[PDB]
Amino acid sequence: GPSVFIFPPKIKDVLMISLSPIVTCVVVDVSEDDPDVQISWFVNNVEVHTAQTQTHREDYNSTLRVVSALPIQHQDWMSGKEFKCKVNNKDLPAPIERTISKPKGSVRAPQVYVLPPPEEEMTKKQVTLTCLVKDFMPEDIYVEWTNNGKTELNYKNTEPVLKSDGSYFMYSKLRVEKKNWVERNSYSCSVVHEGLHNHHTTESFSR
Amino acid sequence: GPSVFIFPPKIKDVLMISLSPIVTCVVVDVSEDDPDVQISWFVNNVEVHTAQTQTHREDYNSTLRVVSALPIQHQDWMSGKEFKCKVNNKDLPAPIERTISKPKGSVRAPQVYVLPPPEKEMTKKQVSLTCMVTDFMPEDIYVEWTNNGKTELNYKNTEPVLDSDGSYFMYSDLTVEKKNWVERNSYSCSVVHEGLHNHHTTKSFSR
Ligand SMILES: *[C@@H]1O[C@H](CO)[C@@H](O[C@@H]2O[C@H](CO)[C@@H](O[C@@H]3O[C@H](CO[C@H]4O[C@H](CO)[C@@H](O)[C@H](O)[C@@H]4O[C@@H]4O[C@H](CO)[C@@H](O)[C@H](O)[C@H]4NC(C)=O)[C@@H](O)[C@H](O[C@H]4O[C@H](CO)[C@@H](O)[C@H](O)[C@@H]4O[C@@H]4O[C@H](CO)[C@@H](O)[C@H](O)[C@H]4NC(C)=O)[C@@H]3O)[C@H](O)[C@H]2NC(C)=O)[C@H](O)[C@H]1NC(C)=O
Numbered sequence: 001g002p003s004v005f006i007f008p009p010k011i012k013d014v015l016m017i018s019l020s021p022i023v024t025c026v027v028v029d030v031s032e033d034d035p036d037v038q039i040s041w042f043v044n045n046v047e048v049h050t051a052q053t054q055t056h057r058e059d060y061n062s063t064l065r066v067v068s069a070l071p072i073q074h075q076d077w078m079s080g081k082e083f084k085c086k087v088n089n090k091d092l093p094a095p096i097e098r099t100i101s102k103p104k105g106s107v108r109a110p111q112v113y114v115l116p117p118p119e120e121e122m123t124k125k126q127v128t129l130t131c132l133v134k135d136f137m138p139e140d141i142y143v144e145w146t147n148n149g150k151t152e153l154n155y156k157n158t159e160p161v162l163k164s165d166g167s168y169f170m171y172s173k174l175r176v177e178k179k180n181w182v183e184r185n186s187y188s189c190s191v192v193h194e195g196l197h198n199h200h201t202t203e204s205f206s207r
Numbered sequence: 208g209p210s211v212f213i214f215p216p217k218i219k220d221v222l223m224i225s226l227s228p229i230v231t232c233v234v235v236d237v238s239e240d241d242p243d244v245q246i247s248w249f250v251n252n253v254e255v256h257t258a259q260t261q262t263h264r265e266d267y268n269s270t271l272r273v274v275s276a277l278p279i280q281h282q283d284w285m286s287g288k289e290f291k292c293k294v295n296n297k298d299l300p301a302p303i304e305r306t307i308s309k310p311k312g313s314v315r316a317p318q319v320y321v322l323p324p325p326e327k328e329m330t331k332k333q334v335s336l337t338c339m340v341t342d343f344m345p346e347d348i349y350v351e352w353t354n355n356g357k358t359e360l361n362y363k364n365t366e367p368v369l370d371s372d373g374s375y376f377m378y379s380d381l382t383v384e385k386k387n388w389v390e391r392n393s394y395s396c397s398v399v400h401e402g403l404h405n406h407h408t409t410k411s412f413s414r
């Protein structure tokens with residue numbers, strides 16, 4: 001039968017007031033025999049009616065997928081309200097319900113440092129700039145590199161790793177042409193996290 | 208019914224001649240009523256008799272698990288020999304077989320760099336030393352920090368990340384007391400990977 005998964009908003013969306021956070025309910029293995037899936041939504045058990053719901057054909061295995069995207073208030077997520085989807089269909093013996101909310105826990109802002117290329121690497125054509133983001137809680141975070149404030153393309157992040165002390169850390173690696181590194185620049189590491197002032201910080205090199 | 212999962216040796220075990228690589232066959236959801244699983248082992252279809260097999264209770268959901276651990280020859284894994292477990296039980300309609308072997312692919316040795324603390328961190332009570340390990344294939348790798356040849360305690364690794372070009376990279380973060388960094392030390396990063404001479408390299412500072 002159909003099964004149901006619930007997904008949180010993207011951390012960047014829920015921390016940036018200008019963005020549009022969404023909680024998503026996905027119903028997989030929907031059948032064309034009973035395709036009229038109903039998804040109802042509740043915020044602390046108060047029903048809301050604004051979700052955008054669409055059916056998609058998954059040709060990988062000839063199934064249907066119903067995706068319901070509920071737009072949410074930033075503060076409702078951040079204050080810990082519960083978001084619940086209730087899934088009804090003619091082929092379900094009983095409704096399926098899923099709930100998600102922001103976990104409780106300590107907040108610790110990340111320490112953000114940018115590290116120059118290793119000296120041994122300076123004889124190469126391309127060099128590596130390292131953004132180190134550490135000592136942060138919870139693990140939800142958004143990290144990017146920018147050049148002149150304009151988001152880069154050739155950067156790669158690690159996933160956050162749990163430390164022994166309970167905080168997390170990650171790195172963002174940026175490969176640049178050595179010419180651009182030696183010449184004066186504004187390569188910067190941008191970090192979006194709950195613990196930061198205005199949920200955002202940037203870090204640049206001194207020279 | 209019972210299901211069967213097979214697992215390769217740990218990369219450190221199979222690359223280091225002093226260690227003991229194992230291929231493991233796990234039979235999950237064995238029943239109290241028919242618990243007598245017979246597990247036979249084959250290396251390139253030649254039967255071998257050295258595996259150690261044990262039954263365990265899983266208290267999370269009150270089930271049984273049979274774990275069969277085959278000690279293997281390092282070179283047999285590295286040269287691509289196939290390792291096969293055949294699982295018999297009376298509640299099985301037919302035997303279940305699993306095979307595993309070293310995946311094919313290109314080998315590229317890691318570039319290994321050690322990075323000093325960010326200058327803005329040097330006045331704090333603790334500093335971070337970074338081992339940056341890049342440009343390696345396959346992703347299977349082992350990294351540690353040592354001081355005076357002894358393995359450190361307060362280091363944590365990221366999991367390898369796939370780069371655009373098909374290579375992988377990771378970081379190992381060693382946090383030390385700033386006093387110990389400033390005074391003479393021998394902090395070093397050791398990397399175990401198939402592409403390295405004797406599968407091992409080390410990188411130190413102040414050189
Ligand atoms: C036909 O083909 C279909 C297409 O492949 C296939 O659909 C797939 O079905 C599987 C289930 O069989 C389902 O798997 C789940 O995936 C969850 C993660 O989904 C993410 O990421 C994957 C890729 O990693 C994507 O494919 C998904 O689309 C989804 O992407 C996210 O989408 C949201 C909203 O669109 C975005 O906002 C995100 O940004 C985006 N992320 C990314 C990275 O892209 C995963 O969470 C599920 O795991 C949980 O359930 C399992 C049980 O099924 C457990 O084993 C597992 O441990 C997890 O358990 C949960 O654990 C929590 C904490 O540990 C608990 O709190 C929960 O209660 C617990 N849940 C349960 C149920 O126990 C799961 O692996 C795929 O998502 C789905 N793909 C799509 C595209 O729909 C069909 O199955 C095929 N059918 C047949 C008959 O063959």
Ligand SMILES: *[C@@H]1O[C@H](CO)[C@@H](O[C@@H]2O[C@H](CO)[C@@H](O[C@@H]3O[C@H](CO[C@H]4O[C@H](CO)[C@@H](O)[C@H](O)[C@@H]4O)[C@@H](O)[C@H](O[C@H]4O[C@H](CO)[C@@H](O)[C@H](O)[C@@H]4O[C@@H]4O[C@H](CO)[C@@H](O)[C@H](O)[C@H]4NC(C)=O)[C@@H]3O)[C@H](O)[C@H]2NC(C)=O)[C@H](O)[C@H]1NC(C)=O
Pocket residue numbers: 212233235236265267268270272
């Ligand atoms: C009771 O509770 C126990 C304990 O939780 C539970 O046992 C687990 O059962 C699940 C299956 O239901 C097992 O899942 C597999 O895990 C594999 C990894 O296992 C390691 O890591 C986990 C933690 O991450 C440890 O718990 C574990 O001890 C090992 O260290 C994973 O590899 C498996 O995934 C493969 O198989 C599934 C199909 O089942 C498939 O969906 C995956 O995509 C993947 O498929 C394989 O893909 C490769 C390509 O990459 C392909 O080559 C290969 O052919 C595919 N193989 C198959 C079979 O498809 C899977 O997720 C888990 O290991 C069990 N844990 C333990 C500790 O035993 C019981 O199931 C519970 N029982 C009940 C009744 O509740």
